[PDB]
Amino acid sequence: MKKYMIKNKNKFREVVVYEDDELRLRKELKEKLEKYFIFPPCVFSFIKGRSAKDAIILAKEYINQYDYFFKCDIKDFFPSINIEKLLNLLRKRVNDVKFFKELEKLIIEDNKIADFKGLPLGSPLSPILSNVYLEEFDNYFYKNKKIRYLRFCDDMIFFSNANIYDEIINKLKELGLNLNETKTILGAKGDSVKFLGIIINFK
Ligand SMILES: [Mg+2]
Ligand code: NA
């Protein structure tokens, strides 16, 4: 028994497949896995102590400080996650072999439920694993002193004095990821932008 239930938006895999118990083991592993990662502070989704509201406050500050901004969003993010790349990223930090083994088994089970298309939206593990997946991407743009960068799930905005969207698109391609070309916004200083549903104005 499992049709569908719109959750945040749509999807076309996972459903009342996930209903409890298996949720507990996934929720327990998620809490265990949070102790292995400190994601860069420019990432605001699925992390205790952070929220979309924080990203909006930072965006409203950063927009006054750069000549350009680029707002974009990853297309079909969770279905697009490469499992082999995700498991290589996990093993670099989860050096507890028993915990890594349990995580790997569940990820492979979740991927099968997703019909081998990335991670299912109904698994409690998928959100934190999406942050693992983009951690090196996030740090690459975070640690650049000449730009600012904010991400909430698949939604990103970059503030810079030189346009970098070609580099963004390429770094995403290294992860198997693409932008939703329809929702991409470039702006010059003085322009407003919609980010996470909020209009952010210069000054
Ligand atoms: Mg998207
Ligand atoms: Na930066």
> What string of DSSP letters covers 129-175?
HHHHHHHHHHHHHHS-TT-EEEEETTEEEEEESS--HHHHHHHHHTT
Q: What's the 183 CA to ligand 1 centre distance in angstroms? A: 9
Rounded to 5°, angle at Cα 174 from 187 and 120: 90
Q: Give the orientation angle of helix 125-142 with respect to helix 97-113, to 10 degrees.
A: 110
The structure was resolved to a resolution in Å of 1.6
Q: Is 47 annotated as a binding residue?
A: no
Residue 159, exposed/middle/buried by CB under 10 A (0-12, 13-18, 19+)?
Answer: buried
**C-beta separation of 164 from 181 below 8 A:** no
- The pocket of ion ligand 1, defined by CB under 5 A, consists of 73, 154
Ligand nearest to the CA of 152: 1
CA distance 75 to 153: 11
Q: Are 52 and 60 in contact (CB under 8 A)?
A: no
Q: At 140, give phi and psi (nearest 5°).
A: -60, -45
Experimentally, the structure was elucidated by: X-ray
Taking CA atoms, 200 is separated from 69, 149, 164, in Å, by 11, 15, 20
List all residues 6 or more positions away from 25 whose beta carbon is below 8 Å from its beta carbon. Answer: 106
Ligand number nearest CA of 130 is 1
195: three-class secondary structure by DSSP: strand
Strand partners, 158: 70, 149
* Residues 200 and 60 sit within 8 Å (Cβ to Cβ): yes
Is the CB of residue 108 less than 8 Å from the CB of residue 4? Answer: no
Does residue 154 have a known ligand-binding role?
A: yes
The edge-to-edge listing of strands for the beta sheet with 155-160 is 148-152, 155-160, 68-73, 185-188
**In a 3-state reduction of DSSP, which class is residue 6?**
coil
Dist. CA 137 → ligand 2 center (Å): 12
Cα–ligand 2 centroid distance for 125 (angstroms) = 28
Q: For residue 153, which ligand has an atom nearest its CA?
A: 1
Pairing label, strands 155-160, 193-195: unpaired
Helices (H), the chain: 22-34, 52-62, 77-80, 83-93, 97-113, 125-142, 165-173
73 in a labelled binding site: yes
Distance, C-alpha 4 to centroid of its chain: 23
**Which ligand gives the minimal distance to the CA of 146?**
2
Distance 57 CA to ligand 2 centre (A): 16
Whether 29 contacts 129, CB under 8 Å: no
